[PDB]
Amino acid sequence: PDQFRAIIESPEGAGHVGYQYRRNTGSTMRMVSDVLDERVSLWDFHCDPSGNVIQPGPNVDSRQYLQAAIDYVSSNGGGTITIPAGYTWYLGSYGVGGIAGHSGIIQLRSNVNLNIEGRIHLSPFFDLKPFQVFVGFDNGDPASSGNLENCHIYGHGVVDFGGYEFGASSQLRNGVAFGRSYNCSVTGITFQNGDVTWAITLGWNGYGSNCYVRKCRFINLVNSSVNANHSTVYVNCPYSGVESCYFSMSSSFARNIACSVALHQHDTFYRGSTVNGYCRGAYVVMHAAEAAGAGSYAYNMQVENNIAVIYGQFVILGSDVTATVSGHLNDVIVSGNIVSIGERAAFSAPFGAFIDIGPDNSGASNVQDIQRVLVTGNSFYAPANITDSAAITLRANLNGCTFIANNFDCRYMVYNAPGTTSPVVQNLVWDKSNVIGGTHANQRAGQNLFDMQFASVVNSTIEVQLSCEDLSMFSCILFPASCQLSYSKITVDSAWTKSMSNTAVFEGNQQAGANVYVSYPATVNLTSYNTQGAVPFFSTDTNYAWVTSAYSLSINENLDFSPPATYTNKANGQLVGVGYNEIGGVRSVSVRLMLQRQV
Amino acid sequence: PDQFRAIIESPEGAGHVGYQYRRNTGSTMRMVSDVLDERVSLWDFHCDPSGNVIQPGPNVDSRQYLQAAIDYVSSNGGGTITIPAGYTWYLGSYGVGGIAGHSGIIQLRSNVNLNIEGRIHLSPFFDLKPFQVFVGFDNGDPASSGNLENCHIYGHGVVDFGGYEFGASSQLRNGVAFGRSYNCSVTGITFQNGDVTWAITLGWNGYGSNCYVRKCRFINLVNSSVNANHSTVYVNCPYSGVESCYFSMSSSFARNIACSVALHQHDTFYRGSTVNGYCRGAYVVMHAAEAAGAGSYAYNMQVENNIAVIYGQFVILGSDVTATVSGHLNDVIVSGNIVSIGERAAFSAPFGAFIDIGPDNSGASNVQDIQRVLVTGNSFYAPANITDSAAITLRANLNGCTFIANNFDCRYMVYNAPGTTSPVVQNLVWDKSNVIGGTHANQRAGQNLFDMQFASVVNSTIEVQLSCEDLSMFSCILFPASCQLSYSKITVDSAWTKSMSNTAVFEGNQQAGANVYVSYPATVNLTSYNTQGAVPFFSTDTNYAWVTSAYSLSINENLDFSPPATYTNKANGQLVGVGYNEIGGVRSVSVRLMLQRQV
Amino acid sequence: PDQFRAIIESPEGAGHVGYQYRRNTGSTMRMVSDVLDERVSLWDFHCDPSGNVIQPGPNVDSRQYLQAAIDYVSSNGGGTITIPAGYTWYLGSYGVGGIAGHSGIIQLRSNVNLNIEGRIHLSPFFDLKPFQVFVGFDNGDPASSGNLENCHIYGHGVVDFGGYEFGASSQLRNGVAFGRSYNCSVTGITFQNGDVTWAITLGWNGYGSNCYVRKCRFINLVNSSVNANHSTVYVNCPYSGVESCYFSMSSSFARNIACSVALHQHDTFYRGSTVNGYCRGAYVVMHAAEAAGAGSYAYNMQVENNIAVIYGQFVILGSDVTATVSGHLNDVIVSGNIVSIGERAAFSAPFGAFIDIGPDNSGASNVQDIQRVLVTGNSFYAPANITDSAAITLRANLNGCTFIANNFDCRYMVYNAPGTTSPVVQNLVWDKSNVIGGTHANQRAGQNLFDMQFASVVNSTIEVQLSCEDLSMFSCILFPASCQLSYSKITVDSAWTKSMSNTAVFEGNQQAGANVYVSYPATVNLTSYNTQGAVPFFSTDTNYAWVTSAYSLSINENLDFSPPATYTNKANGQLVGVGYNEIGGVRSVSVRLMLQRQV
Ligand code: NA
Ligand code: NA
Ligand code: NA
Ligand code: NA
Ligand code: NA
Ligand code: NA
């Protein structure tokens, strides 16, 4: 029984000490080691070859120990490994095997969860180098990778990227690359103090399902001019999403390169999150080059109930093609978001927009197939000095987008730069229930509120309603002569428009088209015949051959006569109405009319 | 001290080994067994009568062991039992006592939580039989059952129903029947691989409170033609709800029988979820037969921010009565949802709808009391071939429903089949801010976009606004002669309507009613008197005794004369206006007019 | 080796029993005590000075033991202390040191989380006294307090305030005072059975960040007439919020004093929650006295997707000033909420409102700077008897608020009491897409639906659209003569208005202003000249010098003549139009017209 003492102090000691839960006679007779075996931590693998525990710290590379933990638990069919609180665990080398191709540090495995309670930091070994901290691929070539299933990272802990800048723009950096990922998630974790490309990526070219980021924080993850691009969470598998997250950047470079979320496959969502200091809110794009796993269509895309202060564009819609695949984007909803462009000089960052219809990465504007988008019940505000702010910058072909019950307070409502791209536009619908704010009133000299710089516009509705005066603007809406316009409805409500010289402008007289339905205010000079009694008044100009009716928006300050209340036209392009001369005499008046065509 | 060795290897050994937390002198001097007693797992009860641990597996019935665990922890005032990861735990027999009446396997108890990390599977013993895996009732008769309080099921684990079909349609199958359930929840769990009636039910005929399903997954839970009906989560207690869940079906039968969520009591919600492959999204119904615990009214019902691909109806509203109780439904909000009918043949599944006002289970349409419903900021799409798709199928009495700022792209906006039910309709409001999509343009031969096949319509608003042409439709809106119409506003905007032969149709000339307020386009033939100068034009037809004013929607291609810009009527039903003959002569013209009555 | 037995039974025994995880030869050789040291509970500190464990209960004050636990774990860099299930832990004395100034019981520390699984109760020592159960300040003076970081309270447990009433109204009571709090949260916990001021407060006069309350329950937390005021969660730091919570009160006093949530700093939110029995839903206010930590502006404020039954006001907007600081409120969104005033007598609780623009605490109405607010896609209902119910009670200066696509069913749409405050109103926008319900129809004798009792109104839009008749109302909208009105648009749709004697009323003839744009129905008497043929009709009254056009809303029951379809005016204030006498004769008619000015 020296033997006994010896057994007890050995590593098998706890397997010799009996235990029965709460002294319950119906409970299993076990050994202490069995109960301790119900949980597992990094401390169970963070040892030297003699089995002595090693303390973590800035001069200890914890990577091989965490790997051994994950490998072992994997072997038993899964479990959760805790990364203990009250310690910082440094990683100091790359991983080996399948994740080496991805610059991987740690390889994730199916059914093995990590509960990160303490902090994981990157050591300076990784300064100026690429890295992907957690990698769910098992092969250098992702196309020959197996899947990562049922892997969850959660807890109150922290992944800190050590503040190192990128060494070259062509490098990639990631926190969690889940890979071909099914039922994987990240919950509760703070990712901070980096220059990276993404914090988390979900899926790989459409392969994956049911991947989620929830209640995480992403802080200061861009810090250098070297960083080519950033999207904090990249969602590349369907039935996946980001909710209730917090995203914050403080670097100037983030204002030009960083986006909070990229949704790239069907049935994906971005909800309930707060963003500050980023260039962009979310990309919603079907890339043909990423369509292998879930088809060529991004549909059922939701961006809802977010709060953002950004410097560029809130939501960016896109689709593109490759030699063998064509991407399509449809069935999108953007709702309940409250968004503002932060304080900045005009033109000092990418052009401010709530919605951008962007060209593809090669700058092409004639590849897109975006339709059935609903933008509703959102608020948007840009400070008065930011010339480059729009409800929508429509810079590439659009096959449909519907706006209802939004409140836009920025420089333009609809915009595209002239002499850039000439988008083909179908089914753009701007309902009268969109409220146009007044922050930019008096700033619009030389500018058109809806600046329709497109190749063509068809099956579209623009119902302009102002809610305060802005007599600085050139017009409420303007179509250049190069824009064709057909089968559309364009109206300008008269409220706050009485002193405007131009309300709607059709530089190619496009409002005359057979299936164009318009109404807008204009000032018209009329002259009557001399006849006492019922008497016609006629416009002095002959520009009104397209008008179906017109009615007065002016009071009559005369006693001895009245001009017609309503007008029709004549073949020569004059307006004509019947007024009344109590006393005879040729009359001459200037009257503000509502001009109507087919409405 | 042989005695000592003996004690140590006994089940009481760990109660003899001292422990003090982190060697802290101010900490409690305890024994190892005390610390191990702070947690509990199934392994502590999964033993034979000699106390030897039994390994789970396909030929071990784990049921009695889990029951013993729950019973014991219950006895101590609660706790959380872990079901360990890396194992599959099979259930192989029914439970006994109070849950036998409910085909129960395991009986839940108050304050005893289950942390399901591994997998629970059903053994073939249950093939072709009913079952309810977890049951919170303590009595065969639910009316004499006590309550289940503070019971939470959570973790990353799985409940797998083993793929067995129902044996007969009259059978029921459930995952979690919480019973008369207060402060109970299911979080994180995957329910899969079944033919069941429900995965989870919350409450019992209104008794319960604060029950929630969050972040769960429900996959492939209908698989046979035998299954009579399915609702994945049935919410039958108030102050309860489903959020951020995922629901997926792949069976053809699911497309005809399955609904994701049923909300059956007040202050219930269904939010932030994704649905694919189901017939229906949510039932929102006050059943009089289920009104004992929380009253006869379902109010404060929320369906928001969901994503769905379904084959039948997205939200189904209802209420019914019994001999002693009348159910009422009011104060409902349906918002922010993006929903589509999946690819399918017309008529191949239940009639496609965003909203359905359904008859009761016996098919009665004259019992319902549904009002104060708001449907707003939703998107809906059905593929062009699906004739059987509507924004709303109004098949039973309706006391109110309001639509604002939605985007509906399907075959019908408002529909009910003729010669079926004749609903009595009050307070149906279709605001002008609803955008009508164009996917079904050219498919509407013989059909009315708003097909008002009701007994009567009162206090209703239908403001039709098209956003593209569809000249295939018979009319935009049609009331048959059997539909009474009063104290209502019906308008058709002229945009895209110029070539339509019929815009609004009142087969019983209902637009003449004293408190009917209408406007719509029509083509009218007029003839003038020969008089030079101001001259009247009169309609050749006498169908316009109800018109209060009309105005031109046509240009005047003549020089020598103009027709009136505006018209009123005369007792004989002619229109009359004053135009102008520059030169005398009887004129005859066909003009497109906006007809107005009291607007 | 008596020595060995002795060591083993000592507190260091477990540090002598070897363990190696799952017998894995590559795992660390540790001792049992090392694995037990990975977790910590209250039981590790709940002992007498001899180290004997003390059982909790009503006659044990657990406070010093919990404090020792938190202090010790703090010393190691953090961790999570469990408060065990199956026990109730009573607190019975105040804490000492820095939290004594705040009436603190327990002092929270950074990185130390509490997992509350059992119940924490207050002992009667605290009856009639102030208390703040958990306090994150480390100093009596909060301005000299350090921060509380990374502190999370979570679990399925309960904080029960023991039902004690306040002893005096000047006392404060709190559950969790996080203090200057950064990355702190409360999840899953039930707070119940009290008379307190707040359950949880986040931040201190703007200092803090990333504080959240989620999935908590707050039940019956006001119970006496002594309680001065209550806000269940007070959010006083930015980037912070409340989601998916449940709030319930049953006391009469709660209906007059209690609010569920107070949002007091920028980038804060209140979402997805259910409220019942409270006076108020949420305060959204920038208090100048609380602007030290995060600036003078509350912006990015979100209240969305809540469900509420309240007795007073749902959302209350405010801002105020101090001698050195001016508070501002802007960029607010209120969306998707479904709210009702519970059953109560008129005037029996604070005035019912969806939105209230409230004066400051000293009652001043001329300090506020509230603008860029969007209220959209909400539902509101008050029972027909509650005279004191409004969509918005506008009781203090307003610099902007926009309403779109809401459904309001209550007594008033816009209200302020006369002869109280005279608010200055700018940029109030009431879009036509707001649906006005009919519950209060026939109850509005002597009342104006939009009762514009303000000093002035500018840059505002009120588009009234009824959806049923209410001939009991005095008018749809009324401006008293003391209200100036300019640069505004005020319209009343004619639907359901044909029998109204007054539609819009301008008691000071304000609709004549140069930049006022109006339209509304009126009945007008006209008389014609005797001339056969085209013939003028003139109004008998001369009140129409402001009218720019008018058109008929009446049918013509005559054969021998027709009145004009449209009218203009003359300098003397008569209307004039040209009709037609088939046969000559002076005509005299009463016609319902739409009067238009500049629209
Ligand atoms: Na759309
Ligand atoms: Na062109
Ligand atoms: Na309604
Ligand atoms: Na009928
Ligand atoms: Na606004
Ligand atoms: Na005044």
Side-chain angles (χ1 to χ4, degrees), chain B residues 201-212:
Chain B
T201 58
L202 308 181
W204 171 76
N205 300 10
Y207 284 107
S209 204
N210 296 149
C211 292
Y212 311 102

Side-chain angles (χ1 to χ4, degrees), chain B residues 321-371:
Chain B
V321 307
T322 69
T324 62
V325 171
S326 295
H328 311 264
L329 179 63
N330 37 265
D331 310 300
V332 174
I333 188 167
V334 183
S335 69
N337 298 287
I338 177 165
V339 173
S340 66
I341 307 305
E343 172 190 353
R344 60 160 179 90
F347 303 108
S348 59
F351 195 116
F354 189 72
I355 307 302
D356 182 37
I357 313 301
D360 76 5
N361 183 55
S362 285
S365 51
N366 58 0
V367 301
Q368 286 71 18
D369 184 13
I370 301 167
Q371 64 196 305

Side-chain angles (χ1 to χ4, degrees), chain C residues 73-121:
Chain C
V73 171
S74 183
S75 79
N76 286 331
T80 299
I81 298 160
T82 298
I83 313 299
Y87 297 90
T88 301
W89 306 84
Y90 292 73
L91 302 174
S93 57
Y94 290 114
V96 298
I99 73 168
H102 304 279
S103 295
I105 303 176
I106 297 286
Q107 177 172 4
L108 306 170
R109 286 184 202 285
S110 299
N111 308 298
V112 182
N113 304 321
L114 305 179
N115 175 27
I116 310 181
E117 283 311 292
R119 298 172 65 90
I120 300 191
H121 286 198

Side-chain angles (χ1 to χ4, degrees), chain B residues 1 3-4 7-8 16-24 26-32 35-36 38 76-80 87 113 150 152 154 183 185 187 209-210 212 214-215 239 243 267-269 271 299-302 304-305 331-333 335 372-374 376 402 404-405 427 429 431 433 459-461 463 487-489 514-515 517 529 531 534-536 538 545-550 566-572 576 578 596-599, chain C residues 4-5 8-15 17 22 32-34 36-47 50-53 72-73 76 85-86 117 156 190 215 217 219 244 246 272-276 305-309 336-340 377-379 381 405-407 409 432-435 439 465-469 493-499 534 551-559 561-566 578-580 582:
Chain B
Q3 48 197 108
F4 183 66
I7 288 164
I8 293 295
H16 288 79
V17 176
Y19 173 71
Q20 188 169 53
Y21 178 69
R22 295 198 173 202
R23 284 160 304 276
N24 171 37
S27 275
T28 308
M29 303 176 185
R30 318 171 72 185
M31 300 286 149
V32 169
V35 193
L36 299 185
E38 298 181 355
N76 286 331
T80 299
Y87 297 90
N113 304 321
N150 313 319
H152 306 286
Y154 70 91
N183 192 48
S185 77
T187 311
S209 204
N210 296 149
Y212 311 102
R214 307 187 182 101
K215 301 187 285 187
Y239 303 114
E243 36 184 353
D267 292 270
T268 56
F269 61 86
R271 300 198 290 249
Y299 62 91
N300 278 358
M301 319 291 280
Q302 189 176 67
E304 284 180 344
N305 294 349
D331 310 300
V332 174
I333 188 167
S335 69
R372 302 196 304 271
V373 176
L374 172 70
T376 189
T402 306
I404 323 177
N427 305 295
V429 175
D431 190 72
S433 67
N459 287 321
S460 300
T461 300
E463 307 179 290
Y487 287 85
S488 295
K489 170 186 188 182
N515 293 276
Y517 298 77
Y529 291 169
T531 314
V535 64
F538 303 90
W546 55 271
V547 175
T548 58
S549 68
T566 69
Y567 302 80
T568 192
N569 73 340
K570 294 178 23 183
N572 66 351
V576 57
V578 176
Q596 310 189 118
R597 171 173 177 75
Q598 305 191 108
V599 298
Chain C
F4 183 66
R5 170 172 208 184
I8 293 295
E9 308 194 82
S10 84
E12 287 184 50
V17 176
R22 295 198 173 202
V32 169
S33 64
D34 301 319
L36 299 185
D37 284 347
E38 298 181 355
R39 53 79 273 154
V40 61
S41 81
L42 187 48
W43 286 127
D44 292 298
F45 294 82
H46 210 267
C47 62
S50 291
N52 308 303
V53 77
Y72 187 86
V73 171
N76 286 331
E117 283 311 292
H156 294 113
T190 296
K215 301 187 285 187
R217 303 200 295 163
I219 308 172
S244 296
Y246 169 73
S273 303
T274 298
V275 179
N276 183 30
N305 294 349
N306 301 294
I307 301 183
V309 176
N337 298 287
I338 177 165
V339 173
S340 66
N378 303 286
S379 198
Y381 163 75
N406 299 285
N407 183 178
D409 192 6
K432 206 169 187 187
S433 67
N434 293 293
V435 170
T439 294
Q465 174 72 74
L466 305 178
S467 47
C468 67
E469 211 171 59
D493 186 82
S494 67
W496 291 280
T497 77
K498 78 187 269 179
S499 306
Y551 68 90
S552 177
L553 303 175
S554 290
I555 62 161
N556 176 28
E557 85 277 10
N558 298 291
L559 196 68
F561 79 95
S562 57
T566 69
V578 176
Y580 193 72
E582 174 78 38

Side-chain angles (χ1 to χ4, degrees), chain A residues 212-223:
Chain A
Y212 311 102
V213 183
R214 307 187 182 101
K215 301 187 285 187
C216 292
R217 303 200 295 163
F218 307 91
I219 308 172
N220 291 335
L221 294 183
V222 170
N223 70 23

Side-chain angles (χ1 to χ4, degrees), chain C residues 12 23 43 46 70 90 106 150 155 195 211 226 294 311 320 334 341 379 426 430 440 572 581:
Chain C
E12 287 184 50
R23 284 160 304 276
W43 286 127
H46 210 267
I70 289 168
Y90 292 73
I106 297 286
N150 313 319
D195 202 28
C211 292
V226 178
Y311 295 86
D320 56 52
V334 183
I341 307 305
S379 198
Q426 318 184 31
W430 183 284
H440 292 243
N572 66 351
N581 257 339

Side-chain angles (χ1 to χ4, degrees), chain C residues 232-560:
Chain C
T232 306
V233 182
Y234 192 98
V235 182
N236 210 14
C237 53
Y239 303 114
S240 294
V242 176
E243 36 184 353
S244 296
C245 286
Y246 169 73
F247 299 84
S248 183
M249 297 264 195
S250 63
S251 86
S252 63
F253 308 110
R255 300 181 185 200
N256 295 306
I257 73 146
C259 189
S260 75
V261 177
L263 302 179
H264 282 291
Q265 301 295 331
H266 70 90
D267 292 270
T268 56
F269 61 86
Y270 178 30
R271 300 198 290 249
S273 303
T274 298
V275 179
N276 183 30
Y278 274 72
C279 188
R280 302 168 178 118
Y283 283 104
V284 177
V285 181
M286 199 51 221
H287 283 307
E290 291 188 334
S296 296
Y297 296 79
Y299 62 91
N300 278 358
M301 319 291 280
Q302 189 176 67
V303 182
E304 284 180 344
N305 294 349
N306 301 294
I307 301 183
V309 176
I310 55 154
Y311 295 86
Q313 306 94 29
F314 173 61
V315 168
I316 307 87
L317 302 189
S319 74
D320 56 52
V321 307
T322 69
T324 62
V325 171
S326 295
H328 311 264
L329 179 63
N330 37 265
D331 310 300
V332 174
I333 188 167
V334 183
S335 69
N337 298 287
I338 177 165
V339 173
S340 66
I341 307 305
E343 172 190 353
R344 60 160 179 90
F347 303 108
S348 59
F351 195 116
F354 189 72
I355 307 302
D356 182 37
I357 313 301
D360 76 5
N361 183 55
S362 285
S365 51
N366 58 0
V367 301
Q368 286 71 18
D369 184 13
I370 301 167
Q371 64 196 305
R372 302 196 304 271
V373 176
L374 172 70
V375 186
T376 189
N378 303 286
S379 198
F380 185 63
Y381 163 75
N385 69 295
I386 303 169
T387 305
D388 54 314
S389 58
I392 178 167
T393 49
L394 207 174
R395 310 190 293 124
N397 289 2
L398 179 67
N399 293 326
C401 190
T402 306
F403 292 89
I404 323 177
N406 299 285
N407 183 178
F408 299 112
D409 192 6
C410 46
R411 184 66 62 91
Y412 291 99
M413 292 302 106
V414 174
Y415 183 78
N416 186 43
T420 61
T421 58
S422 292
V424 175
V425 177
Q426 318 184 31
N427 305 295
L428 172 72
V429 175
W430 183 284
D431 190 72
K432 206 169 187 187
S433 67
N434 293 293
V435 170
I436 301 172
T439 294
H440 292 243
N442 305 119
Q443 311 292 330
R444 299 187 178 97
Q447 304 179 309
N448 313 304
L449 183 65
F450 286 75
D451 200 358
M452 307 299 277
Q453 300 284 333
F454 310 122
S456 55
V457 175
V458 65
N459 287 321
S460 300
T461 300
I462 308 290
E463 307 179 290
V464 184
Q465 174 72 74
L466 305 178
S467 47
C468 67
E469 211 171 59
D470 179 15
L471 301 179
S472 61
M473 75 178 98
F474 184 71
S475 68
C476 297
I477 182 161
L478 184 142
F479 295 79
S482 51
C483 186
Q484 285 55 60
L485 174 67
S486 68
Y487 287 85
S488 295
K489 170 186 188 182
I490 306 296
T491 63
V492 180
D493 186 82
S494 67
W496 291 280
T497 77
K498 78 187 269 179
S499 306
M500 296 185 77
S501 41
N502 313 301
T503 52
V505 176
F506 302 88
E507 290 195 338
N509 301 308
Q510 298 98 312
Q511 85 275 53
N515 293 276
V516 181
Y517 298 77
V518 313
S519 62
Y520 58 93
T523 292
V524 176
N525 289 307
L526 304 149
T527 293
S528 78
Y529 291 169
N530 77 316
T531 314
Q532 193 277 329
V535 64
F537 286 67
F538 303 90
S539 66
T540 63
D541 284 344
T542 45
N543 287 323
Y544 311 102
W546 55 271
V547 175
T548 58
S549 68
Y551 68 90
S552 177
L553 303 175
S554 290
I555 62 161
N556 176 28
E557 85 277 10
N558 298 291
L559 196 68
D560 290 355

